[PDB]
């Protein structure tokens, strides 16, 4: 990407409400406010953000070729599975990093964050760049393999520390069906189904769309607050986790942008559309994943993966990855 861009975009986007509200809640939390956005208000912000994202996902699916979406969906899946394996051959193998810890931290970094995706969509709009309106609906095709792969490559490493310790079965369907029932992803699945079959244009332009950026600023405040709380969790686990939490989201994005960029060539996929894939990739599960991984990989230490994903994974894919991969797609615009 252009340095003259990623700098412009960054100091620009750092002054936008979306990012200004992330680092904003990061510093009132750092000054120890007794401020608390109620738990009830942050689950309805997620519902709004995700029905809205899903209503247009579904409304623009009822025109699209379902050939145009073919390649981005398969790349959407292959990243989710790959990212877990990268955490397996490049962090699990370091000292004081229990593999079953890194495999869960890879399953959160493979999994998606809607609030980071949402922060990236209202940036692309805000910056007059356009993207497939079904690009949002890539999100679940990554959120679920990544979680699954982490759970299944975990409950394999432990079935290999079993068969080795003696010489001297994981149900996948239920977890990708549990993943599909999560509130966030269900909010999407409902908005998607509504805009394919019903005609929710009325309530979208009068409710779900007007409030998207306003409730996102709150959610972005929330997510930079809950990003600071989890920082104490990182001292308790290794310090390799801090290096991964920093550089993994800039690596995971490029691998996506590279793959993404196989369709400013192959099937026409937009430069906005690959920015959405790259930013989906870099994001770190935050809310949905940590329960799904507490459950399928229980020996995993939630300081390792909940502290990596929420304290550094999210503030970097919002603060640094959005203005970097908007800036890369933007340099691909010579003359």
């Amino acid at each position: 990407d252009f340095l003259s861009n990623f700098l412009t975009d960054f100091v620009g986007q750092l002054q936008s409400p979306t990012l200004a509200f992330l680092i904003g809640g990061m510093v009132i939390a750092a000054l120890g406010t007794q401020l608390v956005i109620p738990e009830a208000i942050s689950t309805i912000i997620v519902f709004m953000l995700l029905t809205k994202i899903g209503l247009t996902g579904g409304m623009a699916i009822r025109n699209s070729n379902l050939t145009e979406m073919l390649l981005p969906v398969a790349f959407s899946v292959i990243l989710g599975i790959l990212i877990v394996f990268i955490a397996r051959f490049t962090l699990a193998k370091l000292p004081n990093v229990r593999t079953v810890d890194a495999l869960a931290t890879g399953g959160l970094f493979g999994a998606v964050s809607g609030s980071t995706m949402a922060a990236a969509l209202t940036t692309l709009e805000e910056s007059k760049i356009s993207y497939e309106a079904w690009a949002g609906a890539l999100y679940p095709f990554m959120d679920i393999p990544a979680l699954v792969t982490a759970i299944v490559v975990a409950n394999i490493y432990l079935n290999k520390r079993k068969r080795k310790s003696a010489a001297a079965r994981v149900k996948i369907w239920p977890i990708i069906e549990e993943s599909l029932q999560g509130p966030a992803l269900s909010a999407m699945l409902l908005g998607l189904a509504l805009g394919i079959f019903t005609k929710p244009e009325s309530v979208y332009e009068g409710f779900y769309d007007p409030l998207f950026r306003g409730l996102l600023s709150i959610l972005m405040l929330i997510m930079g607050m809950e990003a600071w709380s989890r920082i104490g969790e990182l001292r308790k686990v290794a310090q390799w986790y801090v290096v991964y939490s920093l550089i993994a989201p800039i690596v995971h994005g490029f691998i996506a942008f590279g793959l993404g960029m196989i369709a400013h060539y192959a099937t026409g996929f937009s430069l906005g559309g690959v920015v959405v894939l790259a930013v989906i990739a870099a994001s770190s599960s935050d809310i949905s994943g940590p329960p799904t991984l507490r459950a399928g990989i229980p020996s995993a230490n939630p300081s390792a993966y909940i502290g990596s994903s929420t304290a550094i994974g999210t503030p970097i894919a919002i603060g640094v990855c959005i203005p970097l991969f908007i800036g890369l797609a933007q340099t691909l615009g010579a003359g």
Binding site: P291, R294, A295, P298, S299
Partner: protein
């Protein structure tokens, strides 16, 4: 006015349905879940058992299946039931 055991399971939020189903199977009458939190956020079951073998058997199952990787403390009080149809005399008592 018959006696019974108050088995208390205060453990992690995740387990709610997985422990609620272990209790439902034990032969326990009913239970009461609270939302709680603490250090050492949380959950708390209060289960009243006729036998003490049941209050233990419930505490044994939740600790065999979940307590090597999820946190939580199971303690038993010893109370004394005055009323409740599905427990003390079905009437009066």
């Amino acid at each position: 006015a018959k006696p019974a055991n108050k088995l208390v399971i205060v453990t992690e939020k995740i387990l709610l349905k997985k422990i609620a189903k272990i209790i439902d199977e034990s032969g326990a009458k009913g239970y009461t879940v609270m939302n709680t939190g603490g250090k050492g956020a949380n959950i708390k079951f209060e289960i009243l058992t006729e036998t003490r073998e049941m209050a233990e058997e419930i505490a044994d199952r939740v600790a065999v299946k979940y307590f090597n990787d999820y946190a939580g403390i199971i303690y038993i009080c010893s109370a004394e039931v005055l009323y409740g149809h599905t427990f003390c005399g079905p009437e009066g008592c």
